[PDB]
Symmetry: C2
Subunit: 383 residues, 2 copies
């Protein structure tokens, strides 16, 4: 059931913003590791004396990396005279965020019809305001409300190129890397208590619970009207045999925050080949691969969707496969993106639910918790 | 003249430590950009609940990247019970350093005969103590005194593998990258006043002034007995036509700090080919290349050292050449390593002064300030 109860018009995920200590080094690492090109900047060279912000793109996926300069460079400015291109930015907030949480996502940004309306309606319906609507160059409106922890949900609306004040990046510095990633599929938060988190966010968005179908978590998914904005939220389950990874996250993150970003690839085989080639030369590492019994067990569950060769290819790359009643999901998880065992990335591709493909086709891979356990148990027997 | 007045026995540069917000992302970027392999770690996986530290090596060059975890992970510890592998580390110091200066060098470490003696003698002779001598696993001694700004000179001495508590890195995560870099040649500081800086450092080390031979700087070089530890220091010259780059550094860095690291290559042509291939895919950018008149002018000044083809190769890679009365220097400068226009890297190779090669052979390239200006002026005429 989809009650289509959005309290304002939501379009798609627009961008994800990381708050960094040094935006240059994080952006360059991510660019090489994920195959995203440098497409826009706002920094000292564009007249921004407040923050350095670098935008990477791959298809429609937009990753923004931002760090503060010395406050001394902008000490004479006030908000009316600011040279910041992102008016919600604050030196103190950014330094406090990074000292508390380490490298991570500050903003989950969605494009809406009218960011001022979205903000007003959200706050009227319980949202905690974070940054009021601000019109940039009479062209783009941006506003922010609290989502969970120190993560904000950012609303952006366009009258009619990333943001005013950002400049397109010099062709020489813009190498056209591309490993197949095309858009943000979903963005997942970890919280201490799932119930209140869901009630809060669903309360101010009108997002509805998206239908699903000993692992240390309970989870639920909030979705927009056309179910293309997908926001799963996890809480820990305590007392388990293995300590809940959600609880480890909350401890190392100093509380709630964004757990993972799931990036859709138009060719997950090529994406994983390219990313794995680069794991040990600056890119990203992946979780340990499932045992061969997991891939033998694939024939029985998805042998009608993937050929033996395609199952062989999943095995070579360590890809996981799940299925619900409507579609099939190919997925894999990186190791944590930075020092702390907190944020990581998921690569996904979805098969089925053709209408365009409906959002969330195949689910989120919850069936892979028990299939990984069974396959791990099976391999001990097969040894 | 070399009075050989070192007040304690100094061996060679040992390592350089960067204080980071996220050590993982900086280390991975530097590894790919410079061709350094991951060789040791001290982090949560080795039992360190205090800081994440990753060591990159290329030949004898050692770059250490360190960031603090949440203090909550180690809140029950005291210094006698610490799980930090670098006992001088302090969460508050590291966060304050990074918030003040951004990404940069915290420690210039030199290997000495006896770090406890070096520390005592240094402080007896004016050095401001930063961290007292600490013996690690009865095997290595480490001590720190202030050098300039918030940069420390770190003394390390070994009874007889980086530091106790560090583990060698898994072969799979240790890709054997190598673009030819072999050791740290010199490390350069920017200060507001050169005179007092020289007097302070020369005072507590016994390092002597190393012989040299409108650009916005005055500089002098301090050197150890065998002149293999080389510490140039710059001060700005104000009122110039173009604003002094030393003054811009001090403004964006919030005061004195390390300006650049000069890395010796055993094959500067290969190093620059490999680094330039990677500039726009995660690595490092280089300063704009000199005009072709600069390379035509090379025939008259170094045509007895480099062939036409070797001069052609310098031109293709943007390499600068200088010469003193004893040797020839090939050098080139990167753009700043991070967000701020502060720290950068120099790649160098020295020709001559064969005895082994004596330290500082060919100088530091001061002659290239006027030759760059003349060549720039010449190219305007040749247009
Ligand atoms: C994050 C996620 C999702 C997910 O998207 C998601 C949402 O979108 C919304 C709803 C709720 C939700 O969760 C789905 C499935 C997942 C994961 C996920 O994060 N993870 C790795 C994980 O649990 O991290 C600890 C890792 O546990 C392990 C610890 C130690 C090992 C040692 C050896 C091993 C060998 C072989 C395989 C192993 C697997 C896991 C190992 C392990 C393995 C998985 O496995 N699934 C299958
Ligand atoms: C750092 C250094 C050393 C050095 O090691 C050193 C020590 O070890 C110890 C003693 C003192 C000392 O200094 C030696 C020589 C250097 C440098 C160095 O840092 N730099 C670049 C620099 O001054 O940074 C602003 C850049 O200025 C420019 C601004 C704008 C441009 C625009 C177009 C251009 C086109 C072509 C060439 C250009 C060159 C410089 C341009 C420029 C160029 C140089 O050039 N030399 C020649
Ligand atoms: Co997911
Ligand atoms: Co130099």
């Amino acid at each position: 059931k989809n009650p289509k109860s959005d309290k304002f018009k939501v379009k798609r995920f627009h961008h994800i913003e990381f708050w960094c200590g040094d935006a240059t080094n994080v952006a360059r690492r991510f660019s090489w590791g994920l195959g995203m090109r440098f497409s826009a900047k706002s920094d000292l060279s564009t007249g921004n004396m407040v923050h350095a912000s670098y935008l990477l793109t791959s298809g429609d996926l937009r990753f923004l990396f931002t760090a503060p300069y010395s406050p001394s460079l902008s000490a004479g400015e006030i908000k009316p005279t600011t040279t910041a291109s992102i008016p919600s930015f604050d030196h103190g907030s950014c330094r406090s965020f990074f000292s508390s949480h380490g490298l991570g996502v500050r903003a989950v940004a969605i494009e809406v019809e009218d960011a001022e309306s979205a903000f007003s309606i959200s706050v009227a319906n319980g949202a905690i305001p974070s940054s009021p609507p601000i019109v940039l160059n009479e062209a783009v409106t941006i506003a922010e409300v609290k989502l969970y922890g120190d993560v904000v949900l950012r609303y952006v609306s366009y009258k009619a190129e990333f943001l005013p004040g950002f400049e397109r990046v010099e062709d020489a510095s813009s190498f056209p890397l591309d490993y197949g990633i095309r858009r943000l599929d979903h963005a997942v938060g970890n919280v201490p208590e799932l119930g209140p988190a869901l009630t809060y966010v669903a309360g101010f968005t009108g997002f509805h619970q998206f239908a699903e179908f000993e692992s240390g978590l309970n989870s639920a998914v909030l979705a927009s009207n056309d179910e293309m904005v997908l926001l799963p939220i996890n809480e820990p389950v305590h007392g388990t045999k293995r300590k809940s990874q959600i609880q480890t996250y909350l401890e190392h993150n100093e509380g709630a925050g964004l757990q993972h970003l799931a990036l859709m690839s138009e060719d997950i085989f090529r994406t994983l080949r390219e990313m794995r080639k680069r794991s040990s030369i600056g890119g990203f590492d992946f979780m340990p691969s499932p045992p061969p019994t997991y891939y033998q067990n694939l024939k029985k569950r998805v042998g009608d969707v993937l050929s033996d060769d395609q199952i062989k290819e999943c095995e070579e790359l360590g890809i996981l496969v799940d299925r619900d009643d409507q579609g099939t999901l190919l997925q894999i998880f990186t190791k944590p993106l930075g020092d702390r065992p907190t944020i990581f990335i998921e690569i996904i591709q979805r098969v089925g639910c053709m209408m365009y493909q409906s959002g969330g086709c195949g689910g989120f891979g919850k069936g892979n918790f028990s299939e990984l356990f069974k396959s791990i148990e099976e391999y001990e027997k097969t040894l």
